Amino acid sequence: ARPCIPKSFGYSSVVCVCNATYCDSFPPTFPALGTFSRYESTRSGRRMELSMGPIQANHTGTGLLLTLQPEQKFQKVKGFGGAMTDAAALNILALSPPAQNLLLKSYFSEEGIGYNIIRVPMASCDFSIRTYTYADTPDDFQLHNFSLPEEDTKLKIPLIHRALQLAQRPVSLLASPWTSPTWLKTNGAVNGKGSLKGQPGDIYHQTWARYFVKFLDAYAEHKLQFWAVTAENEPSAGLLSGYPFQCLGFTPEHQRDFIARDLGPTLANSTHHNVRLLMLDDQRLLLPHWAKVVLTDPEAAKYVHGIAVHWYLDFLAPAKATLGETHRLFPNTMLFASEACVGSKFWEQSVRLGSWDRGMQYSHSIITNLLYHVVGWTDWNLALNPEGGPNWVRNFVDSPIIVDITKDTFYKQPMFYHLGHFSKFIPEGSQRVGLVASQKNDLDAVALMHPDGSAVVVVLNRSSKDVPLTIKDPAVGFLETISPGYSIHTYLWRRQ
Ligand SMILES: *[C@@H]1O[C@H](CO)[C@@H](O[C@@H]2O[C@H](CO)[C@@H](O[C@@H]3O[C@H](CO)[C@@H](O)[C@H](O)[C@@H]3O)[C@H](O)[C@H]2NC(C)=O)[C@H](O)[C@H]1NC(C)=O
Ligand SMILES: *[C@@H]1O[C@H](CO)[C@@H](O)[C@H](O)[C@H]1NC(C)=O
Ligand SMILES: [Mg+2]
Ligand SMILES: [Mg+2]
Ligand SMILES: [Mg+2]
Ligand SMILES: [Mg+2]
Ligand SMILES: [Mg+2]
Ligand SMILES: [Mg+2]
Ligand SMILES: [Mg+2]
Ligand SMILES: [Mg+2]
């Protein structure tokens, strides 16, 4: 294992500096029964530092106790990852090959944080430098002129293969479109207010559904298979006049009927029938309404595997009214967080190198999502430049890895480590279990059990105050620990 090379840029914490010959690295340590592992990251600069401690048979005192309830079972976890946008691919490929491989290993290798999801845009988005679709030849309803351009064949696809080949965990791919070809749209433009022409069940909608199959066919020719697709990225965006970049507007009723008549049946009657379909792929305030509109129509519901949710400017929001209510109404339709990013005010710089606050936003969001039944959490761009780009409409945002081309260097932000406290230690098939606090407290925490029956607990302290605490597992005993102010911990232990 190789330690963080820390660097401050004046924010509250440090980045870890990587280059062609060096990057910080680690696989999770399950010590002997009766011992626990602790991984600690701190604002002061500790980065996922491993320590161990004893598990006692007994505990006495008045301090905070967190008690696992391993017989209280909740959702199974699909996983964690990020988005291979054109911008992410361009930034990674701007490094020398050895630096590229250390960046990819940081995310995708067991030496890194064990990502197992990659979100793949279907053609261009704001994090593109060229506006294109896969079928720009006008009025090509047959999709004879459907093809993948070099953004896919020379940048994204080869990087996806490289990422998958570094992983031991199976990696799941998720596809989402931003716009259709403009000749399928009411406004004839990639951006602005515009929807598919006509109505679900017609030639425009059947062509758009077929475009999904042609996309999956084309990636399958490149030996890539998808776990899932979403029905549209941010369908509410295309309802807005002046929307600045690629979009395709659907009301929830339009999405319902498109799924029922066109996309569901077209996918089901294809070689890609095992690919899951996720609805919504948009902000939380649209729930539970969107779920009610789509999932109460049995001819739409039969095709919808899950509900994809985005996080933006609401990482510290309460989720009971949106995620909680949606789970209560539709508990057998999984919730999955398909996109999250930190945005700045329109006049502010998008990237804050070394912001601990942005790290805490990521981990607080992941904990909140897990406590409201969400099965996975997906970051946005895997890497950006120090401006938060490139981006053809200057809609810059932050990313967990920032590439500086001019020094063949990349910077791992606090967000990287906050996500890794979950991704590295919560394999696919892990299950959230109960965790109860003895007294009111300022901590954020979640407990899960691995498929093999091991325990994992994440404890985030967004306060400035150190909090001594005890964790009880009724089968092994008590972990006496401390949660320092501005820390995040992941605890691991064997239960037998
Ligand atoms: C990439 O990052 C690594 C880690 O921060 C940098 O590693 C450093 O590499 C230099 C190589 O010149 C090492 O310097 C050595 O200094 C001694 C003492 O003067 C000298 O006798 C040696 O010949 C050599 O120059 C340095 O110790 C090493 N540090 C670590 C922690 O491994 C590397 O420089 C970075 N690459 C670039 C291009 O900045
Ligand atoms: C579209 O595909 C057809 C059939 O292969 C081909 O004849 C035509 O040249 C293509 N059109 C364009 C504009 O590429
Ligand atoms: Mg600290
Ligand atoms: Mg308790
Ligand atoms: Mg897959
Ligand atoms: Mg408009
Ligand atoms: Mg495919
Ligand atoms: Mg409007
Ligand atoms: Mg978005
Ligand atoms: Mg981003």
Author numbering: 1 to 26, 28 to 497
From the paper:
The lysosomal glycoside hydrolase β-glucocerebrosidase (GBA; sometimes called GBA1 or GCase) catalyses the hydrolysis of glycosphingolipids. Mechanistically, GBA is a retaining β-glucosidase which hydrolyses its substrates with net retention of β-anomeric stereochemistry. Retention of anomeric configuration is achieved through the Koshland double-displacement mechanism using two key carboxylate-containing residues; in the case of human GBA, Glu340 serves as the catalytic nucleophile and Glu235 acts as the general acid/base. Inherited deficiencies in GBA activity cause an accumulation of GlcCer within lysosomes, subsequently leading to the most common lysosomal storage disorder, Gaucher disease. Here, the production of active crystallizable GBA in insect cells using a baculovirus expression system is reported, providing a nonclinical source of recombinant GBA with comparable activity and biophysical properties to ERT preparations.
Consequently, our GBA was studied by X-ray crystallography to generate a 0.98 Å resolution unliganded structure in a novel crystal form. During initial screening, crystals were also found under condition A5 [0.2 M magnesium formate, 20%(w/v) PEG 3350] of the JCSG-plus screen. Optimized crystals suitable for structural analysis were obtained using 0.2 M magnesium formate, 19%(v/v) PEG 3350. Previously, GBA has been crystallized in space groups C2221 and P21; however, this unliganded structure crystallized in space group P1. Overall, the three-domain tertiary structure is highly similar to that of the BTP complex and Cerezyme, with Cα r.m.s.d.s of 0.49 Å (Q score of 0.94) and 0.60 Å (Q score of 0.94), respectively. Despite the sub-Ångström resolution, residues 26–31 and 314–319 were challenging to model, reflecting the flexibility and disorder of these loops, which has also been observed in previous GBA structures. Importantly, the active site of this unliganded structure compares well with the active sites of Cerezyme and the BTP complex. The sub-Ångström resolution of this unliganded structure permits the first ever atomic resolution analysis of GBA, uncovering finer details in its structure. In fact, many alternative side-chain conformations could be modelled throughout the structure, providing more detail on side-chain mobility and interactions. Multiple alternative residue conformations were observed throughout the structure, including two conformations of the catalytic acid/base residue.
